[PDB]
């Protein structure tokens, strides 16, 4: 159940590490630092089914996800990200977030940020849409915040267990680990309440969407690309990854009537 990235065979290695980040993020060296230097940095990827964990450890850099950027780009996960070592600053709906050792940040994709990390070494869940769709009201409020606190070392704690057990962990577990994830994060998001910009990206808008409306019998193409402001092409290039909108239309309501050169784009598919 295993993928790997790292540049440490390679010699121009921030360059590699850009590549394999850009579908999610574009990334700049510190101002003063040289591409000489190098960029020793590593990807880390287990598959719990669905949801995505991510070992990460890497050198100080800035991050952009951006407004262009989700006009494309058909990744919408919910971010949850834990530091073991280092500190981020994150920009958001002119809101600046910052996160140390032993907290998390969370994060739609969906959304654009801009910001800087220290060095770090960091443990990122990625959740699809749906998982979370349910609690989405309090989720697109607390958007780009910190979990802090003993609800959050709860959810540390769990993580830490978890990825001390990776690599034995076995499928018939997965399912439940995925809904204490789910419960434990959900559960951490109620937090303090800013108060709103909100320029969502085009599919995070269209699996809302979709979600809102699925039991409405006319959920069809046509009505979603009208209620997005979009073109029946650009619908069909979001959903090419997962088969198309009807198939993914489709997999959901069969769910609904249920219980009744590599990127981290490619890591973010999960087929």
Known sequence: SRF??????????????????????????????SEEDGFPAELTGWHLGDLLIVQQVTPAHSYERSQTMLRSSPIDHWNVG????????????????????G??????????????????????????????????????????????????????????????????????????????????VVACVAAVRPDSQAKM????????????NLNSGDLTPETICRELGISRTRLYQLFEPSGGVLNYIRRRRLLQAYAEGATIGDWLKSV
Not at 4 to 32: K, N, Y
Not at 128 to 144: I, T
Not at 201 to 211: C, L, Q, S
Request: hydrophobic share 40%; proline share 6%.
């Open 82 to 101: 834990l530091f073991r070592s280092g500190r981020s600053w994150t920009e958001a709906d002119r809101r600046v977030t910052e996160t140390g050792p």
């Open 103 to 184: 907290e998390f940040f969370f994060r739609s994709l969906g959304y654009p940020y801009r910001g800087r990390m220290t060095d770090a070494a960091s443990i990122l869940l990625f959740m699809p849409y749906e998982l979370l769709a349910d609690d989405a009201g309090k989720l697109e409020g607390a958007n780009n915040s910190v979990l802090s606190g003993n609800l959050a070392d709860l959810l540390a704690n769990y993580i830490n267990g978890m990825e001390e057990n990776l690599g034995n962990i076995t499928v018939e577990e997965v399912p439940r680990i995925v809904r204490t994830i789910r419960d434990m």
């Open 201 to 212: 990206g085009v599919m995070e808008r269209a699996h809302r969407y979709i979600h809102l």
């Open 4 to 33: 790997s990235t790292r540049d440490l065979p390679p010699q121009e290695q921030f360059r590699s590490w850009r590549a394999h980040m850009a579908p999610l993020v574009d990334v700049r060296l510190p101002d003063g630092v």
